[PDB]
Amino acid sequence: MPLVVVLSTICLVTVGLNLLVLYAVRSERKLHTVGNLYIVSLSVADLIVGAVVMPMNILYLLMSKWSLGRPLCLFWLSMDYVASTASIFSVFILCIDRYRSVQQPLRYLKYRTKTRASATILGAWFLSFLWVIPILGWNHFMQQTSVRREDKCETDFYDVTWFKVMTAIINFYLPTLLMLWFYAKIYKAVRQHCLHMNRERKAAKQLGFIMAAFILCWIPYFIFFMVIAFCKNCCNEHLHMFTIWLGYINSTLNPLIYPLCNENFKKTFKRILHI
Amino acid sequence: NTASIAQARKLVEQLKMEANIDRIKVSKAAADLMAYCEAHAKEDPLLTPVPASENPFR
Amino acid sequence: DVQLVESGGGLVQPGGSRKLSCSASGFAFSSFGMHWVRQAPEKGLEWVAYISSGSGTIYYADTVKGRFTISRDDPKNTLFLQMTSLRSEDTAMYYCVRSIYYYGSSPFDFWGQGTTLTVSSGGSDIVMTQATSSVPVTPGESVSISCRSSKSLLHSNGNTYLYWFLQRPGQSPQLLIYRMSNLASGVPDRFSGSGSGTAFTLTISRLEAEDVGVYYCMQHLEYPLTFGAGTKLELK
Amino acid sequence: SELDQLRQEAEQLKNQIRDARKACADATLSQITNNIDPVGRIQMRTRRTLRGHLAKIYAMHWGTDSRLLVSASQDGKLIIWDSYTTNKVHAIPLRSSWVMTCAYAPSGNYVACGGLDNICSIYNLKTREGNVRVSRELAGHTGYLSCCRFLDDNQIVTSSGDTTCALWDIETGQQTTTFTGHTGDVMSLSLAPDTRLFVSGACDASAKLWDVREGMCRQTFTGHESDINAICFFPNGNAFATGSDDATCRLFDLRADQELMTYSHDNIICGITSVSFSKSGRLLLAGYDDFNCNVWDALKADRAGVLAGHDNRVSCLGVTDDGMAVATGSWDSFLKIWN
Amino acid sequence: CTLSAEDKAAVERSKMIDRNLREDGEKARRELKLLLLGTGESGKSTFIKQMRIIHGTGIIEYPFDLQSVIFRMVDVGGQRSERRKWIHCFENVTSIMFLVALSEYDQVDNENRMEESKALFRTIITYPWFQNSSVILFLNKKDLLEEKIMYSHLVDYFPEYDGPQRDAQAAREFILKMFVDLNPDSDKILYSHFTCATDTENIRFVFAAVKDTILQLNLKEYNLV
Ligand SMILES: NCCc1c[nH]cn1
């Protein structure tokens, strides 16, 4: 069973790096700064994905059934949706902060302070935490409340094309388009021509890598469940597991993307690699 | 220049006053300093912490 | 020197309304809390009202709560005490009293000159007791005065919130000793404090004829501040 | 040539000094303190955090009663705290927001602050008006005023960028004696517990021990290579300790007139911002630029029990007069009192 | 709460103190410090007072309110002490404004003024204490430069000039280039300008300059540079 070797590795490292990033910040000083709050929020969300969300998908790709039972399925779905949504929203708030940073003379009304940053993380995580209700909202999708299927544990809104489209609009496509808008504005800001002629190329490398990782990771899942909104012939369980695994991959990739290129973290990683 | 001569005279006087010092051998100074640290050793809350009953900082 | 002057001492038929004004000149009024203390003709000082700095908190004695009002005008540096439905049991002198609270402060340090308010036609607090009412004194002698409390004022943090005030004939009370051992500015070293717990001692040695007066104990543990009846020292 | 003769005579005087210093060096401190019981792992924890400053905290000083605590920040404000209950007692705004140091007078009445305005201001705390106002503005320096300390109700010692210290008489407002003899700027100052002598180290790697009444330089200590910017006597006042940009603290002896011991970490290449001793003088607590603050064994020169609680450089520190607690103040606008 | 009476009052007073602190912080947290420098009695104070007029040993501090931000020019430098252990109060400053007088050329004690001034300029621009701060440069009084061009050639004191006898624009460009070259191998962004009395735009550039400076640090924190 080769897959259990690979996927488990992916989750086992996913904790480690995130935890290593976490242990990097909450232990060492000089990093106790503003943007590292965003970094640690992203890393915490990804650690939750790696901890409470990945093993259950390991159980699917290992077992033939959700052997856990209904309340465990509800809890796992809650944690997966909340943690993935919080990861996306945390990346989005980090992007909007960078855009405000590079577009404005200063966060000049005292906007850069740590208390407001922490408030922003709290708000983003809250708006993600509203994902708790709909999974426990079986009293709005009455057409499927007596429906239980073996192949999946039945997220219980999978055939609601209306709510599903609205979710995809308000959750990933709007933030991703705004992400692209903000980073394009940042790049058009960098282009000063007054480091000379290499600043632009370095900025292109970094920002393109960021946005490309995000979009390539998180399209094939959102676009595909927007597809199952009407496709009944997609044998959709297999592509579901593949795409959601691609979506989880971005969670373990983030520690190597955002926090790796801020303070270079080299001394920290070398000192505390052993947790 | 007379200013340099005056500065040199001041320096020479300073060094002369630094010469007529009844030096104490470093061994005696170290022994005295260590004995002092020993004598008031029990009276140091940063070295022998006070029980919480008599600690104003909880 | 600092200065407080009060006004509004009208003579009214009972049940009426009045206003009393304490104009401050000579200190930063915006940083001091203020009290209002009352003196019946042949009784001791009793506490009436308190308004803290910036009007953050306000406290009243039980005998007056919901009946008196108190207010501060910071830019004009003035203190108001508005009276509604005044009983005949309020005909009294009123002293506007300064007060600052911080570590090492000296509350009740300076007092207004007082104004007369003549109108004619409790429990679960502390009470102070005066073992005597007067003491026979030949000048130059060493004497002392003893106060008692129902509750030991020595709080948990080591402070003892007991104050001693002197009132010479014809003047406002002036603070003698705050927190039972610390004497105020301008107080000759003759006076000193002693005792503990529930028995408090003001000891004066080499008494001077200028020191003849009436001595008062203030507890200050509870905002229902309770003065003692106090003892009148007399010249022999 | 008179200049050449004077220089030559100074040269053989220096040679005599070196010969005498070598002759008296029959051992080093670490040769006699090897057989002493080590302190052991002692960890102190942040008991209070005094917050309310907005910019970095530049210096601080405990009162004599060891409870009150005056701290001066880049905010252009001094704040007089109550370190037992964290309540601010006073907040003093400044005429010039450029304050580099402070001082709480031993009587508890006056607080001194000075800085780039070349003037040491003496704020009077215990007044009728209930506010806190300058009672004297001590001017007479030309350079920048580094560190000023009190001796009594009327005599305050200052050290400035004139490469000079001064013994100001507050009541009259003019310096009684001026201590000259440094070359660099006198970046730090310290007073003997008996206040008969003080000491000061300068931006020339040298420290100098000054007499208050005689006004003539008693002796000079060298051995540092970068700027001595922190000094605090061993509590008996017969020894002495400095911290410099050498990533090194040094302990000198006032009767041996030579270096006594050193404290350093090779991996540390950053400077030192303030030192102090404990009440028993056994521990040389020193801040550092790496945001930490070490607690050296001031006798064996071996400990790394670090007061690590600050998110930026530890600027100033000290111990209470009775030694219950140390305090530190760092560039993160927080004063943390450790015990 | 086991606090006694006076303890409660003390807490209230400390809250009042914190209230006043917050009120002053409301303007203190948005203030930038811009260290103003110059040598030769060129009149740096006069130039700052001129900005104060244009739009609304000693230290003189000049507030500016630009686009809902408070700048605060710090004017110090009349002291001759060993400034290394006194510029510590300016270890992290937003920018270092350096004023030069262009009229200094072929004008002396016994030495022409710009050699000393530019030695001072390079000394400041190369301090390790100031590595994170941009350096702004204000070449003041150019009308008198034009007047002196009708008299004095640059080659009369600095032989390495090359250009027409009365090419004022060449003079400005050469002098600005002269001050730019002393920027060391380090990649520090040295700003520049030429101001005049009616130069109502020059103040804006300081704001503009500071903008870019902060922008640079941001990009320098995100490794986009
Ligand atoms: N598999 C990721 C679940 C999710 C959350 N939000 C949108 N989709």
Side-chain angles (χ1 to χ4, degrees), chain D residues 242-258:
Chain D
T242 59
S244 73
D245 289 345
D246 276 29
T248 301
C249 293
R250 304 257 198 119
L251 194 152
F252 307 87
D253 186 74
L254 287 196
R255 284 181 298 155
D257 192 29
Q258 65 182 357

Side-chain angles (χ1 to χ4, degrees), chain B residues 5 8 12, chain D residues 1-11:
Chain B
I5 294 168
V12 167
Chain D
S1 172
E2 298 85 358
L3 181 60
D4 288 288
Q5 292 167 345
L6 290 169
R7 176 182 56 77
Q8 289 168 344
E9 189 170 1
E11 290 167 358

Side-chain angles (χ1 to χ4, degrees), chain D residues 77 88 98 118 144 185, chain E residues 18 24 61 79 82 86 91:
Chain D
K77 278 176 208 256
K88 297 180 179 70
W98 302 106
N118 296 132
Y144 295 93
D185 291 331
Chain E
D18 279 8
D24 291 331
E61 300 163 349
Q79 292 76 3
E82 183 65 13
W86 304 119
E91 162 146 31

Side-chain angles (χ1 to χ4, degrees), chain A residues 33-269:
Chain A
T33 187
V34 175
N36 287 340
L37 296 200
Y38 289 149
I39 293 299
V40 65
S41 178
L42 163 61
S43 296
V44 164
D46 286 345
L47 188 153
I48 297 169
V49 174
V52 187
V53 181
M54 266 169 216
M56 296 299 102
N57 295 111
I58 303 301
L59 294 174
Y60 284 170
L61 267 164
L62 177 63
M63 301 204 68
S64 65
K65 184 52 151 143
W66 178 255
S67 66
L68 269 298
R70 200 63 162 160
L72 275 299
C73 166
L74 294 174
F75 162 74
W76 169 57
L77 293 203
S78 182
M79 294 300 293
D80 182 33
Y81 279 80
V82 174
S84 284
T85 302
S87 177
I88 293 169
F89 286 172
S90 180
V91 163
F92 169 73
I93 61 171
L94 202 163
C95 166
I96 191 167
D97 172 66
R98 290 179 177 190
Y99 162 65
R100 279 264 272 266
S101 292
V102 187
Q103 173 69 74
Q104 294 300 320
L106 297 83
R107 298 296 299 278
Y108 63 89
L109 304 176
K110 304 178 282 285
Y111 284 125
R112 194 81 171 300
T113 192
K114 303 153 71 93
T115 184
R116 185 182 295 276
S118 60
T120 300
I121 295 100
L122 290 202
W125 267 90
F126 195 27
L127 288 177
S128 69
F129 187 71
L130 293 205
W131 258 98
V132 64
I133 294 169
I135 294 167
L136 309 183
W138 65 266
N139 63 7
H140 312 289
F141 322 111
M142 284 73 74
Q143 57 267 36
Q144 297 294 321
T145 188
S146 65
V147 181
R148 296 290 186 275
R149 297 291 178 270
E150 299 90 5
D151 285 342
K152 58 179 171 287
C153 80
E154 195 151 0
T155 62
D156 210 31
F157 43 71
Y158 69 91
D159 53 328
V160 194
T161 176
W162 179 69
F163 177 71
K164 186 180 289 293
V165 162
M166 186 269 290
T167 296
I169 289 301
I170 193 66
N171 178 34
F172 160 88
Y173 283 100
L174 177 63
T176 301
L177 295 174
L178 294 174
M179 211 156 268
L180 295 172
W181 178 254
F182 296 162
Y183 283 130
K185 283 277 284 187
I186 297 169
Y187 196 96
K188 291 184 182 293
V190 169
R191 284 251 281 191
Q192 293 177 335
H193 293 286
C194 187
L195 190 63
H196 184 8
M197 183 278 288
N198 288 295
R199 62 180 295 175
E200 305 79 6
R201 297 293 299 274
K202 180 55 144 37
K205 179 179 176 181
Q206 186 64 32
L207 292 173
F209 178 71
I210 295 167
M211 64 183 73
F214 177 80
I215 62 100
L216 294 174
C217 286
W218 275 108
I219 296 169
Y221 164 65
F222 276 93
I223 194 66
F224 176 85
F225 91 109
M226 281 181 67
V227 163
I228 61 171
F230 59 92
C231 174
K232 312 308 179 186
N233 57 308
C234 285
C235 299
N236 63 7
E237 284 76 2
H238 191 75
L239 300 175
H240 182 62
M241 293 183 284
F242 176 70
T243 56
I244 62 100
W245 268 106
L246 294 174
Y248 304 169
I249 294 169
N250 166 282
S251 294
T252 193
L253 294 174
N254 295 313
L256 305 177
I257 301 169
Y258 285 64
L260 188 61
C261 292
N262 193 53
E263 302 296 328
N264 317 312
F265 293 173
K266 283 178 182 180
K267 292 179 179 179
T268 79
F269 284 165

